[PDB]
């Protein structure tokens, strides 16, 4: 029935066209029947034509019937496309389509047509059909849609152009897979056919919302856009693959497709922010893709080369893109930033493409209007933590995952300038994030994520370099490898910040898990000390001591293949298993941090900052005891724990009398970030330059802290002690990190962000640590049982030839003779005994002369080196008669000093505005451009002047990253430079403080001999200090008095030699006469001091006839009687001085504290103007010592308390002042509170027991 009805109405048999209406009824009740039939009923039944029937019955000329027939057709596909193919199969789908087009009545169906008929037909269309049959349909259909058939019949096949182009995009789009056979060309066929099609793409996306012609025209444009452009992404990263595992590919214009659908519209248009989105995804799809580079042998291949043009190509077009993203406002910009579209731009920051990555700098300083990259990155982490600190997690972790000979170079370059950028905006002691908020838990994961992945990026850099060094240069290659290094040496220096960031019993285990990322970064650290760069070894020497300290501290492990291969590589085993360059001192400090040096100072600060310093006892508050001196330590250990209290001690000694006479003016610090990093309150301030340069504020340096208004004299406030412990130097203000101490501290509730406070310091803690390393490391000595068991060289006698021809060389004494012959013969310790005028530092130039024909001399306080210096400097006579002179060095920091100073002798051998034009000038350009746009050749000219703004930028950039590659090759020069004067020099001097730098110990030096002058007025532990450069021969030369017995007989500072010559006083070279001081200034202070032996010199009394003396009131010796000021005194040394002008070089004023001495010279500066400055001497008696002048006027303040703080140093004070002249003495002061002291009474007794006592009105008795 149904095929008799079919043929009734077949155009075979009838041969005419058929009414309409039997044709509706006919296709109506095949509809039914097919609601009815299934499928596969369908193919089982129906199919074993109806089809061929429908395509004649097509051509009727009923509008409705035409519908009906379409509908069906629809239908029939829809249902089962697998027989309509096998039926049809005849037919191409090319001949289907121009059948149903080419219709006369299909034109009144278009124009009498919520999306209409066609457009779902054709969509049904698309999908009946194969891949491979989709191409030649569309050369026909599209070109039959848009351009045969060209309103509403003209937006509906404009609709359906649209739609079918969409479908073939979503249709590729969607699939796991595009083959590199016919699958790449048909993509490129059409590819070809959107960019063919673009104008009609643009106007269709062009049109208004709510048009009543706009049927869905915009979104089906603007979806047609988005999938072109991630296809084109996907076909090139796909064809990438291909052709780099050597795959044949086939023999597209990509820039071209992004130029036009940029250069269509980006502002003023509907959905600019959905097409900003795709386009980023677009680009995040081929975002670790690199050009090919060809090996040093060989040569690029032609295929390779075609890729690399159009890859150029593709990255100018993307990276016009990301230029072009910054017109938007700043609103929609961080609400882009803020809302997965991020990515992009954070992966577009590391790409080692120029374009793209400029380009990306460029959109990340305009999102956050901070122009620089650090203070980019800084805000960035301000305002985005957690998004920021995963994207760059992922974009750095995608890159770094596989280590092959196709792994991109390119991009390891920019990696550590953006970690670096990461770190100075997050660990920064003022501007850091991390020392500012607490963490939550997403923020706690984020930074775990980038520790890890910053770790894991060094470690892929240093691993790779034997497979990179196959095909660059040799000079890109040395500067990477110092580059990561400097970056591995700034990412570990900062671990205690993550510990007390991550987080007593919590900071273990946020510490725990921040050294986990260094450990697998191991391995590679301990294989570059092979080559033959001697910068490097010393950054990997360093990063290696600090990570095992660091590692074994926490109690943990080093992986076991770097302890194997470090193991392998320093042992002899006879030779070593892998060839180094390394010297003797690498190897012994790694060989011992493993399992002579410099130990930690970490518990000394606590011990010092603990205290108060307005405790009034006599002893530190803490429980630190002393007095146990047993001379014959046998042990270096039990030596540490006798000497450890007797260095707290003397800190707390020296504390105090600082406190009395500080002389420093108090200034205030703002805090700016508490933190508990590295166990104390480290507390950071930024001080001015004028402050920081006035008061001379370096590391080390001891400062108060106190809410008091005057810090020096107010007890009952809150208060601590402070050191300084990091100085940076800013732009003006010095950013300085003071240390604190939160186990008791007052101020501590008062510590706040905002808390202005007064601060003022007192002492530097330079030579306590040089005493305590030299303490910590006297366990390698080479003189180790003369300086525990304190015995010298034994003495023995020579013939009395030998002793006269020695005599008349150097026109000596048989005191100072015996003496230069024995120090000569013996070696070890060699004991000299004097008075303050035999003639020690005479016998000590005579020795050079004896033992040259390099040395080390030192001398505790400056001025006896400065005398030592010119005195070796002026002449040196060696032991045949012969004037010769020798090479003179100052390892120091006077006038003809400054002449042999290292640091000059150093200093004196070694003695942006094109880019800054080119910013300004682009940026003229770009304020007329964008005002005269708000078409296509101006569009060409505002993308093509700012991407040389985006160039010059990068360059004006790269000019400041360049000052750290000047900067480093600076100091090899200097390392250099001072290694050569450091051998050209014949004697060398230096302060027993000053020789243990800690610079000497990358140096190569050895002082085989060192002299110590005034080796009896110092502590022990600081002649301990210049003995560790191998020295096997040392003269001690001082003074074991300057006691009186009373006093002689505290123990905290005597000597070094006053040990040995109470231990063997039977070898020490005594010297009793004395050749400068007259008589008078020899007898008093000889029977207060010196028991009578201080015999005087052949006819001393005609030798020290200068005039004066002819006044009995000022001769050689007389005593005047009148808050360590004293102006009484002052007044007194002004009329004595003026008295004696009124009746060079030889006239010297002293006062024993710093507070007179400012008043001594204010007031002489004052009235005799500033040429007494250099005329009469004025210096203390701890800047006097060793020197002589003719006249002297003593000044002492005030006699200290018998049991307070002082005494001893005021009695080797008085001492040291009384014995400086060889001709006058005059000593001034009241008698009132100087009869308080024991010693100025004995001397105000033997004043008067001598007619030597001038009382009343100095004034009045002058005149
Ligand atoms: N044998 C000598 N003959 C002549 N003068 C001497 C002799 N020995 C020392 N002097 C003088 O004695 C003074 C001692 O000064 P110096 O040696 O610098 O201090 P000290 O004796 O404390 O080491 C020198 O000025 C020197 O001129």
């Known amino acids: 029935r149904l095929a008799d009805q079919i043929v009734s109405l077949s155009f075979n048999r009838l041969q005419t066209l058929p009414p309409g209406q039997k044709i509706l009824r006919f296709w109506s009740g095949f509809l039914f029947i097919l609601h009815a039939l299934s499928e596969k009923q369908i193919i089982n039944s129906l199919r074993a034509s109806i089809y061929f029937l429908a395509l004649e019955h097509l051509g009727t000329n009923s509008d409705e019937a035409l519908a009906m027939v379409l ?201 600019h922010f959905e097409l900003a989105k795709a386009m980023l995804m677009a680009t995040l799809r081929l975002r670790s893709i690199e050009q090919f580079i060809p090996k040093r042998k060989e040569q690029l291949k032609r295929e390779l080369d075609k890729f690399n043009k159009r890859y150029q190509q593709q990255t100018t077009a993307i990276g016009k893109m990301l230029n072009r993203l910054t017109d938007f406002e700043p609103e929609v910009l961080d609400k882009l930033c803020s809302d997965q579209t991020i990515h992009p731009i954070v992966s577009s920051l590391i790409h080692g493409e120029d374009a793209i990555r400029e380009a990306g700098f460029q959109l990340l300083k305009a999102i ?198 470090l193991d392998s590589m320093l042992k002899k085993t006879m030779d070593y298993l892998t060839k180094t360059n390394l010297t003797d001192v690498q190897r012994i400090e790694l060989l011992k941090a493993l399992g002579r040096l410099i130990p930690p100072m970490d518990v000394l600060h606590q011990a010092i900052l603990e205290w108060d310093i307005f405790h009034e006892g006599n002893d530190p508050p803490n429980g630190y005891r002393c007095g146990n001196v047993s001379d014959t330590y046998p042990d270096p250990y039990s030596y540490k724990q006798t000497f450890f209290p007797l260095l707290i001690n003397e800190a707390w000694r ?103 406070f007064q601060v003022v310091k007192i002492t530097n803690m330079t030579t306590i640590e040089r005493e305590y390393a030299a303490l910590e490391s006297l366990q390698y000595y080479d003189l180790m049982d003369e300086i525990l068991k304190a015995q010298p060289s034994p003495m023995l006698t020579f013939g009395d030839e030998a002793i006269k021809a020695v005599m008349d060389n150097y026109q000596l004494n048989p005191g100072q003779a015996r003496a230069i012959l024995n120090a000569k013969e013996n070696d070890g310790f060699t004991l000299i005994q004097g008075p303050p005028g035999t003639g020690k530092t005479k016998t000590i130039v005579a020795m050079v002369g004896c033992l040259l024909t390099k040395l080390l001399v030192c001398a505790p306080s400056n001025a006896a080196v400065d005398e030592l210096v010119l005195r070796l400097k002026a002449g040196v006579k060696t032991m045949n008669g012969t004037f010769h002179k020798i090479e003179v060095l100052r390892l ?174 039977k070898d020490v070279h005594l010297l009793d006469m004395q050749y400068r001081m007259h008589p008078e200034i020899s007898r008093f202070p000889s029977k207060e001091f010196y028991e009578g032996l201080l015999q005087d010199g052949a006819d001393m009394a005609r030798l020290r006839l200068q005039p004066w003396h002819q006044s009995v009131l000022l001769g050689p010796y007389r005593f005047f009687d009148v808050s360590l000021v004293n102006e009484e005194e002052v007044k007194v040394a002004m009329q004595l001085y003026m008295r004696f002008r009124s009746d060079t070089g030889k006239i010297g004023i002293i006062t024993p504290y710093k507070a007179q001495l400012q008043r001594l010279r204010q007031k002489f500066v004052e009235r005799y103007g500033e040429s007494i400055t250099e005329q009469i001497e004025f210096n203390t008696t701890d800047a006097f010592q060793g020197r002589e002048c003719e006249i002297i006027i003593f000044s002492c303040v005030r006699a200290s308390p018998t049991g307070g703080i002082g005494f001893m140093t005021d009695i080797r004070r008085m001492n040291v002042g009384l014995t400086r002249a060889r001709s006058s003495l005059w000593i001034l002061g009241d008698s009132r509170a100087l009869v308080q002291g024991e010693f100025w009474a004995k001397l105000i007794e033997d004043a008067k027991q001598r007619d030597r006592y001038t009382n009343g009105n100095i004034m009045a008795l002058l005149s």
């Open 368 to 565: 956050t209007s901070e122009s620089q990259p650090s203070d980019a990155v800084g805000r960035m982490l301000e305002v985005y933590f957690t998004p920021f600190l995963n994207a760059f997690s992922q974009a750095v972790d995608k890159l770094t995952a596989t280590k092959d000979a196709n792994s991109p170079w390119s991009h390891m370059i920019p990696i550590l300038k953006c970690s670096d950028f990461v770190l100075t905006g997050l660990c920064d002691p003022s501007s850091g994030q991390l020392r500012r908020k607490v963490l939550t838990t997403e923020e706690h994961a984020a930074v775990k994520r980038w520790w890890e992945c910053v770790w894991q990026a060094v470690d892929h850099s240093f691993r790779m370099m034997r497979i990179w060094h196959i095909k660059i240069d040799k000079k890109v290659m040395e500067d990477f490898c110092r580059d990561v290094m400097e970056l591995g040496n700034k990412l570990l220096a900062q671990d205690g910040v993550m510990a007390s960031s991550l987080a007593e019993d919590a900071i273990s285990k946020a510490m725990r898990e921040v050294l986990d990322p260094p450990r697998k970064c191991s391995y590679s650290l301990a294989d570059m000390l092979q080559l033959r760069d001697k910068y490097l070894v010393m950054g990997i020497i360093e990063t290696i001591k600090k990570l095992l300290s660091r590692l074994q501290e926490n109690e943990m492990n080093l992986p076991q293949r770097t302890r194997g291969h």
């Open 892 to 1065: 120091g920091r006077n006038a003809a000093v400054k002449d042999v100073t290292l640091d000059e002798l150093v200093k004196a051998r070694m003695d942006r505005d094109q880019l800054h034009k080119e910013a300004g000038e682009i940026k003229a350009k770009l304020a007329e451009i964008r005002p005269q746009l708000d078409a296509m050749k101006l569009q060409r000219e505002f993308d093509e002047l700012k991407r040389r703004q985006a160039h010059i930028g990068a360059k004006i950039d790269a000019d400041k990253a360049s000052g750290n590659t000047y900067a480093r090759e600076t100091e090899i020069k200097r390392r250099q430079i001072q290694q050569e004067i450091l051998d050209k020099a014949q004697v060398l001097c230096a302060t027993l403080s000053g020789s243990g730098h800690e610079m000497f110990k990358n140096l190569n030096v050895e002082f085989e001999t060192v002299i110590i002058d005034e080796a009896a007025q110092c502590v022990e532990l600081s002649a301990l200090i210049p003995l560790k450069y191998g020295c096997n021969k040392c003269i001690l030369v001082g003074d074991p008095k300057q006691l009186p017995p009373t006093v002689l007989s505290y123990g905290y500072d005597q000597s070094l030699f006053v040990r040995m010559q109470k231990n063997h006083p």
């Open 71 to 271: 509908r069906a057709l629809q239908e029939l596909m829809e249902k089962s496309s697998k027989a309509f193919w096998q039926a049809l199969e005849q037919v191409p789908p090319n001949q289907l389509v121009e059948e149903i087009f080419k219709s006369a009545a299909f034109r009144p169906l278009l124009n009498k047509s919520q999306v209409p008929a066609l457009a779902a037909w054709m969509r049904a269309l698309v999908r009946s059909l194969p891949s491979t049959s989709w191409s030649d349909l569309c050369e026909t259909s599209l070109r039959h849609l848009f351009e045969t058939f060209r309103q509403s019949g003209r937006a509906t096949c404009t609709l359906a152009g649209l739609v079918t182009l969409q479908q073939c995009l979503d249709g590729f789009l969607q699939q796991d897979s595009i083959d590199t056979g016919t699958g790449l060309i048909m993509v490129n066929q059409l590819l070809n056919r959107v960019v063919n099609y673009s104008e009609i793409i643009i106007r269709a996306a062009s049109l208004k919302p709510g048009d009543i012609y706009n049927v869905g025209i915009s979104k089906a444009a603007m979806a047609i856009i988005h999938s072109a452009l991630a296809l084109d992404a996907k076909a090139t990263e796909v064809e990438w693959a291909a052709l780099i595992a050597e795959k044949p590919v086939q023999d597209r214009d990509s820039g071209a497709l992004w130029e036009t659908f940029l250069e269509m519209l980006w502002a003023g248009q509907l959905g």
């Open 654 to 756: 020296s504390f105090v009398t600082a406190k009395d006479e500080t002389t420093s003016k108090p200034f205030g610090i703002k805090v700016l970030s508490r933190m508990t990093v590295d166990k104390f309150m480290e507390v950071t301030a930024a001080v001015p330059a004028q402050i920081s340069k006035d008061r001379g504020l370096t590391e080390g340096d001891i400062v108060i802290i106190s809410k008091g208004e005057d810090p020096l004299n107010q007890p009952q406030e809150l208060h601590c002690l402070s050191r300084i412990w990091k100085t940076t130097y800013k732009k003006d203000t010095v950013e300085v990190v003071y240390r604190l101490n939160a186990k008791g501290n007052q101020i501590l509730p008062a510590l706040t962000p905002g808390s202005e």
